[PDB]
RNA sequence: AAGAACCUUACCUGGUCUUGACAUCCACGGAAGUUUUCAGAGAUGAGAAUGUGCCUUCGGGAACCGUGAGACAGGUGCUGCAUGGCUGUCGUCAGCUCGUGUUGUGAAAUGUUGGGUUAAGUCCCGCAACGAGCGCAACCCUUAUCCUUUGUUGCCAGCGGUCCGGCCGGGAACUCAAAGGAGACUGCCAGUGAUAAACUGGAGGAAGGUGGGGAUGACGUCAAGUCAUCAUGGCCCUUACGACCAGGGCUACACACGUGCUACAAUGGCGCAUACAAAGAGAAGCGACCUCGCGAGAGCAAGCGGACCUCAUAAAGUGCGUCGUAGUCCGGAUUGGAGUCUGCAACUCGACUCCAUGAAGUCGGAAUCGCUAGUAAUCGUGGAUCAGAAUGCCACGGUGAAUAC
């Protein structure tokens, strides 16, 4: 804000696995205030992915977020017509935040029949660097590098 | 003031008890059959104008048919006029 | 209309309400009719007597009318000669036994409605409004309450355009809820039309 | 739409139907009411239904089984 | 108490209620539950009180 | 003898009576896992008791009404924290750091005239 | 047994009305229980404020009708002939159920 | 406009009335009232009935009814650029003035500003200005915590006894309910700042820098809206711009625009079972229970003018079975047939129920709106108006975010 900086309302760990990142994940994925239906699809997709892939439940979303975790962000420095994309090292809160927003938007975009399938497919395709969220991450880095007038 | 609406309404009040409210129940029992017979025609001879359905609720003071409130017997600007000047008992502002 | 109205909030917390009677809501309207049908009458009859404040309470089987005024004598009369005919018709319009009590109050200029009707009576007699307004505020502030203002509006000075004019002596904290402020309105009438008078009087605090 | 237990025919118009049993078919009758129901005992009448500005002469037939007089009276106007 | 049968609009006397040594009128009667809805005009206002048939006498 | 705590969460109301015994919880004359412990708000009631490790020490008889699943569990949460005075106060001093001793001031804001709800304003025209 | 029920328009009028109702029965000699709260009714009224053009502005008023229940336990001869007629509470609608 | 089938209704087509539909006053005769007959769409004209009560100094009142006459009454007629009153709006942004003193021939200037600080003309320092008034915080209401008083129509922890029903002793502890108090006042410490105001962190506390929300909108502005809520100057109508009655219009249709609601789906559709509310209203009322009809609803039929009785079964949620990306078991438009409820009466122009029909629509161009935390979003409940009729207005709660570099 203008008068002072304000950090968004802090959250507590999730009731099932005790992770503060999964709490933010289910909150962003939630629709119409129905947290129960949201976490039900998140846990169902995570369990089906951990069973299908054969990896641990921790790495089933940590490596999937890691492949969509950016290392640079864009600053609007006005050089290219009152807007620009100067690159700078992303802060950790923003680093995991942009990754979650992209993988959730990719799950919304995916054409699979069930949201559990759309999420388990984006989570699978992300970790092998082929998903839609990977395309989003590997397009902004190119645009930021192309618009690197300053650093 | 528009004396017409007040005159019509005052006339309908007395005439809606002079003919209606006593023989209307007979129409409700016979015409809307409860246990066609020919006794129904004699109960449709009531006055068309004097019917309670025609009666429109109006303000006690000015006869305004819109904005009326049945409980206080006045209109919203009349309730506001008395309410602001402290003439309605305990009608304090709502500030919860 | 942005200015705050004091009589809707002062009578709830610091001042007592002008209608303390309790009645049933299911028959409130008819009772309200009988309540208002004598307040117009008392306003008409006590126009020559210059009424200052009335508090009427109707328990639904009797009606207690309490009246304040400059001179209780003209209203009561010699031993009750005048007041009996007023009580008779009030008891006939309301249908219940009327109890009328006129209280003696020294210096009635500290009440808004008295000064309001006084200026209104001076506007029908065609005398100057500025001198009438100045005396109405001057011989009320020096004699008592810590603040008074009178805002007249409407065809002032015989002009063909709308205007406002007002004097303010002392201080009137109108947005202060604990302030005891008496406020009434009065509409005069002349050939130019209706003139609106508003008077605020601030006596003290709780 | 219509009355539940029987066709409501207007009182004065019922008097006109009773006088029509004795007087038979006649010239168009300009009445003001439109709240009457059609039935087999009403076929053959040549009454004129009111429509504000004018009175439309309607001839009753079998095809008007549940309609009222007001469904044949032009009140509004088209361009 | 005598005069066990009552009728609407008749004056009675309160004996077992808080309004003893005073009279009043019954606005509504309930013969089914045998309860009298009597009002006492005290302080200028109506005061609904419940009375039994056998406890009070007709005036 | 008994250890009591009321607790409230925005619409709900509970009476948490802590009696010595087994580690089970009785809520509305029914078990914990049956009512909602296998679904939403499963372990929020356990967060005050997790810090002190009272696993089989005290039985809780609770009667709660009002609100919904979260509201009832929040009333049970504030009831347990209010009823945590059973022994010496050296354990609630660490429970304050967790943030459950504090009564939440998060309550619904009223609807206002001209608005569809608490803060939503009607759509403004483009021109 | 004497289920007194009071109905008033002000919070500082009904507790004072039931103060004499408790004192003029407790002192003379009877069995009396304290006043039951009996929840206050809040009646709201929302009306349009402007006379000729008013789309989203309204003025909101309300009335709080207070209630009380004394419920005298034993109707002894001392309280039957001394309880009422002395409070002068004209703004309290008393109702009594036996 | 917080309710247009007639009425409402002001507007229109026809039928009528002129001291009148409403009011003061004069004269004359008649108790008022309750009856029906013919004609007309009715307003209404034209007859046949019955009664003559209370009570007066019998001048026969006091009530009312009919006729006649003038003074007159009446108008939601015109003008919110002749007005009162009320209201939107700038804007709850922190501003706006009065006494002296002083300066300039004077309009005017200072005060009303330079430095910190806050939401604030809030406070302090500095200082040719010193003081005061309106406004802001401030006194009001609710919420967040505790104590005292208080237990029926509300409740059942420590206790037991039975219809296993708080139902009954008892407790009145306490869920809840409602009066009176206490508590938050930069107060406690440290640091910073000027040693002043003030700021940051920590402790206590349920809550620290007006804890959260609401009410309350300065001097003034738009000749802003309302002669149609009412009042009112001037002007106009007066066997007519007045008044009554039936029907019609206010709902039309080659169109444009605003505010809203429902959709385009497997996050969901259908079917069964099941858990938890708050705020209100209710006597020509809410209408249990029982029976009939698939049903909308009808008949019979308790309780209460209200923590008792009813509206009222809270819904999203959660378990399974079904359908698998289709113009589909998505979504329902339009139309026909057959009914129910209110009301003289559903007639252009109403609600709801049953059967049949299943348009458009694949998240929408340019553009644009609302929201900083219990908010946005989503799902239900009640109320005003209401003979009977809301996706609008007002109010209440369930779940409950995202994001601020």
């Amino acid at each position: 804000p203008r008068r002072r900086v304000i950090g968004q309302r802090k959250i507590l760990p999730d009731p099932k696995f005790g992770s503060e990142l999964l709490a933010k994940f289910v909150n962003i994925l939630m629709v119409d205030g129905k947290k129960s239906t949201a976490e039900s699809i998140v846990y169902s997709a995570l369990e089906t992915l951990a069973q299908r892939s054969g990896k641990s439940e921790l790495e089933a979303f940590e490596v999937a977020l890691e492949n969509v975790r950016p290392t640079v962000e864009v600053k609007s420095r006005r050089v290219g017509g009152s807007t620009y994309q100067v690159p700078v090292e992303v802060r950790p809160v923003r680093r995991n935040a942009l990754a979650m927003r992209w993988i959730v938007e990719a799950a919304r975009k995916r054409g699979d029949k069930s949201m559990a399938l759309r999420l388990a497919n984006e989570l699978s395709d992300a970790a092998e660097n082929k998903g839609t969220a990977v395309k989003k991450r590997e397009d902004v880095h190119r645009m930021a590098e192309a618009n690197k007038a300053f650093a | 003031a528009k004396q017409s609406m007040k005159a019509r309404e005052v006339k309908r009040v007395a005439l809606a008890d002079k003919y209606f409210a006593k023989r209307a129940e007979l129409k409700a029992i016979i015409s809307d059959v409860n246990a066609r017979w020919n006794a129904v025609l004699k109960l449709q001879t009531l006055p068309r104008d004097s019917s309670p359905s025609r009666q429109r609720n109006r303000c006690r003071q000015t006869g305004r048919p819109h904005g009326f409130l049945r409980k206080f017997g006045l209109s919203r600007i009349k309730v506001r006029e008395a309410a602001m000047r402290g003439e309605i008992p305990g009608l304090k502002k709502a500030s919860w | 209309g942005q200015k705050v109205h004091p009589n809707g909030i002062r009578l709830g917390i610091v001042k007592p309400w002008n209608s303390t009677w309790f009645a049933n809501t299911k028959e409130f309207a008819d009772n309200l009719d009988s309540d208002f049908k004598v307040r117009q009458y008392l306003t008409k009859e006590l126009a020559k007597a210059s009424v200052s404040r009335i508090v009427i309470e109707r328990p639904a089987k009797s009606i207690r009318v309490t009246i304040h005024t400059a001179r209780p004598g003209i209203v009561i009369g010699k031993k009750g000669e005048d007041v009996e005919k007023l009580r008779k018709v009030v008891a006939d319009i309301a249908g219940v036994p009327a109890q009328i009590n006129i209280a003696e109050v020294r210096k009635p200029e500290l009440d808004a409605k008295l000064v309001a009707d006084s200026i209104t009576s001076q506007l029908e007699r065609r005398v100057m409004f500025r001198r009438a307004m100045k005396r109405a505020v001057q011989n009320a502030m020096r004699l008592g309450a810590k603040g008074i203002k009178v805002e007249v509006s409407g065809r002032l000075g015989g002009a063909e355009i709308a205007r406002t004019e007002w004097y303010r002596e002392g201080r009137v904290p109108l947005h202060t809820l604990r302030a005891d402020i008496d406020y009434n309105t009065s509409e005069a009438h002349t050939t130019y039309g209706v003139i609106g008078v508003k008077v605020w009087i601030f006596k003290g605090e709780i | 739409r219509s009355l539940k237990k029987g066709p409501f025919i207007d009182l004065h118009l019922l008097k006109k139907v009773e006088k029509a049993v004795e007087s038979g078919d006649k010239k168009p009758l300009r009445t003001w009411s439109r709240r009457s129901t059609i039935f087999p005992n009403m076929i053959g009448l040549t009454i004129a239904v009111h429509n504000g500005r004018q009175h439309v002469p309607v001839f009753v037939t079998d095809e008007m089984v549940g309609h009222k007089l007001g469904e044949f009276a032009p009140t509004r106007t088209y361009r | 108490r005598p005069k066990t049968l009552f009728e609407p609009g008749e004056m009675v006397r309160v004996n077992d209620g808080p309004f003893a040594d005073f009279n009043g009128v019954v606005e509504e009667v309930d013969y089914e539950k045998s309860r009298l809805k009597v009002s006492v005009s005290i302080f200028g206002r109506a005061t609904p009180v419940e009375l039994d048939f056998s406890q009070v006498e007709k005036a | 003898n008994q250890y009591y705590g009321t607790g409230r969460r925005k619409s709900s109301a509970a009476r948490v009576f802590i009696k010595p015994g087994n580690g089970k919880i009785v809520i509305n004359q029914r078990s914990l896992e049956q009512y909602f412990g296998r679904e939403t708000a499963r372990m929020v009631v356990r967060q005050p008791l997790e810090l002190v490790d009272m696993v089989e020490k005290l039985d809780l008889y609770i009667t709660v009404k009002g609100g919904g699943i979260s509201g009832q569990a929040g009333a049970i949460r504030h009831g347990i924290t209010r009823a945590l005075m059973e022994y010496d106060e050296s354990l609630r001093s660490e429970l304050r750091k967790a943030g459950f001793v504090t009564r939440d001031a998060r309550q619904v804001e009223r609807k206002k005239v001209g608005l569809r709800k608490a803060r939503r304003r009607p759509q403004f025209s483009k021109r | 047994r004497i289920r007194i029920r009071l109905k008033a328009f002000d919070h500082r009028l009904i507790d004072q009305a039931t103060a004499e109702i408790v004192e003029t029965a407790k002192r003379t000699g009877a069995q009396v229980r304290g006043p039951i709260p009996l929840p206050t009714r809040k009646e709201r009224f929302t009306v349009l404020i402007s006379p000729h053009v008013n789309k989203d502005a309204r003025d909101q008023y309300e009335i709080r009708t207070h209630l009380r229940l004394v419920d005298i336990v034993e109707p002894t001869e001392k309280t039957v002939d001394a309880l009422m007629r002395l409070d002068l509470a004209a703004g309290v609608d008393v109702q009594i159920s036996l």
Side-chain angles (χ1 to χ4, degrees), chain F residues 2 4 6 8-11 13 15 17 19 35 38-39 61 65-68 70-72 82 96 101-103 106-124 126:
Chain F
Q2 282 284 292
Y4 166 72
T6 307
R8 32 177 67 96
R9 186 66 186 96
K10 185 170 56 71
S11 182
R15 15 181 296 171
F17 283 90
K19 192 173 187 177
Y35 225 109
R38 51 93 185 179
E39 214 69 23
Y61 191 96
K65 57 97 185 179
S70 178
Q72 281 180 151
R82 280 303 176 181
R96 271 184 158 270
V101 184
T102 288
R103 208 286 190 177
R106 300 290 303 274
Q107 286 186 351
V108 179
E109 182 179 5
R110 62 162 297 180
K111 185 185 174 299
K112 307 168 186 177
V113 288
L115 310 180
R116 296 293 166 84
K117 42 205 297 187
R119 296 186 185 177
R120 179 74 157 92
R121 291 193 291 101
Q123 177 174 327
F124 170 59
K126 52 176 58 182

Side-chain angles (χ1 to χ4, degrees), chain D residues 38-76:
Chain D
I38 301 295
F39 228 48
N41 57 272
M42 304 288 290
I43 308 181
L45 295 181
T46 59
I47 58 181
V49 185
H50 184 48
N51 56 269
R53 43 178 177 260
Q54 309 295 335
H55 293 67
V56 279
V58 180
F59 176 77
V60 188
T61 48
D62 201 304
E63 295 87 20
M64 306 181 174
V65 178
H67 304 280
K68 270 213 181 61
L69 300 185
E71 303 186 22
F72 314 103
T75 63
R76 293 181 177 87

Side-chain angles (χ1 to χ4, degrees), chain B residues 56-68:
Chain B
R56 177 61 175 271
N57 299 143
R58 300 182 183 274
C59 180
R60 184 70 64 88
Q61 181 66 27
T62 66
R64 199 178 195 272
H66 287 272
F68 176 69

Side-chain angles (χ1 to χ4, degrees), chain E residues 28 30 32-33 37:
Chain E
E28 189 178 3
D30 196 331
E32 282 76 10
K33 291 189 182 61
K37 300 178 179 180

